Amino acid sequence: ALSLDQRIQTLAYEELNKAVEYHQAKAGTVVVLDARTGEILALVNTPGRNRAVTDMIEPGAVMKPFPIAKALDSGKVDTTDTFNTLPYKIGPATVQDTHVYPTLDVRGIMQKSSNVGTSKLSAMFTPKEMYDFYHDLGVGVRMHSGFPGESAGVLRNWRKWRPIEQATMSFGYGLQLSLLQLARAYTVLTHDGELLPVSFEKQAVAPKGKRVIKASTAKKVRELMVSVTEAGGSGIAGAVDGFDVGAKTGTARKLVNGRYVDYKHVATFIGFAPAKNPRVIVAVTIDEPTYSGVVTGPVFKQVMGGSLNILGVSPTKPLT
C-alpha cells in the first residue's frame, strides 16, 4: 500500500549511483513526488540513514522561486518590473551575484538566479511577513510523513533577524530544510498555490492543500522557471527532451550530518514537468562532488524523463 513506484525507484537508484560514482561524491539522495498529491513515487539515498528526511541543508538557489512568488502574489511587483541588480552592501556585508548584470526583470532574476534581485524582492516585506511565508511553505515545520527521525529544518524567529539575514534567506542561506521538505515546498508551485501533505502510503482520499499563494501566481512562477532550463538559464543541464521543465539548481550547504556539525557543499537540482501541467517533482542532491548544474542536472534529466515515460505522459514538443 506504498505509493512508491518500483520502476521509478529503480530508475532513481541507478541514476543516483552512477552520478555519485562518477563525481566521486560522499553521498546522495533523489526524491520523486506526485506533483498533485504529495505521494512519494520514489525516495532513494546512498547507503546509511534516510538522508532525504533526516538531514537538513541550507538549500541555496533552489529557494529563490519562493520570495519571487511572494512578491508577485502580493501585487507589489509584476514580472516585467526591472531592478538594479548590481552588488550592494547591508552594513558591512555584500550581496552579489555569480554573474553580474546591471539590471534584470523578474524573469531575468529567475533565469539568471540573481541573489541581488531575490534579496530586493524579499526586502519589500517585513521580517514577520517573510517568516510567516516561509513557515507556511513548511520551513521549520514537521511534515509528520510517518518517517522516524524526520527533520523539521530551521527557521529562526523573525524577532532575531538582521537585514543581512533576511537577504541571505531569500537566496537559501540562514534557513534549513530537508530534501523532502524542499520537494514538498515545490507543491505550492505545482498544485496551484496549495501546499500538499507528503505521504509514502497510497492515498485513499484526495489530500487537502493549505493555500499559500494564488493559483494564478503559481502558474506565472512555473512559466518563469522554464527559462531556467532554456538557453541562457542557469539550469540548462537538466532540460528534458520533449518537455518544458521548471527547475532551479544551486550549491546548498550542509552544516549538520546526523548528530554532528559538518561543513559540506551539496550540489542540488529540483524541478517539475510538464511545466504547464506538472505531474511530478524530482529533487536531487549530491554531497561534496570532487558546478551544481553539471553534477545533478543529468540525474534530474534522466529521472524526470524516465518518470514521465513510465507514467505514460506524452511529450509536448518534438524531440531534439
Automatic annotation (TrEMBL):
Provide the catalytic activity annotation.
Preferential cleavage: (Ac)2-L-Lys-D-Ala-|-D-Ala. Also transpeptidation of peptidyl-alanyl moieties that are N-acyl substituents of D-alanine
Q: Where in the cell is it found?
A: Cell inner membrane; Membrane
Swiss-Prot/TrEMBL keywords: Carboxypeptidase, Cell cycle, Cell division, Cell inner membrane, Cell membrane, Cell shape, Cell wall biogenesis/degradation, Hydrolase, Membrane, Peptidoglycan synthesis, Protease, Septation, Transmembrane, Transmembrane helix
Penicillin-binding protein transpeptidase domain residues? 28-304
Q: What is its main location?
A: membrane
Q: What class of enzyme is it?
A: hydrolase
- Active site location: 61 (acyl-ester intermediate)
| Keyword Cell wall biogenesis/degradation assigned | yes
Its placement in the membrane is given as: Single-pass membrane protein
Which biological process annotations from GO are given for this protein? cell wall organization; division septum assembly; FtsZ-dependent cytokinesis; peptidoglycan biosynthetic process; proteolysis; regulation of cell shape
Q: Which family does it belong to?
A: Belongs to the transpeptidase family. FtsI subfamily.
Q: What is this protein called?
A: Probable peptidoglycan D,D-transpeptidase PenA
Organism annotation = Neisseria gonorrhoeae
Identify the segment of the full-length protein shown.
237 to 573 of 582
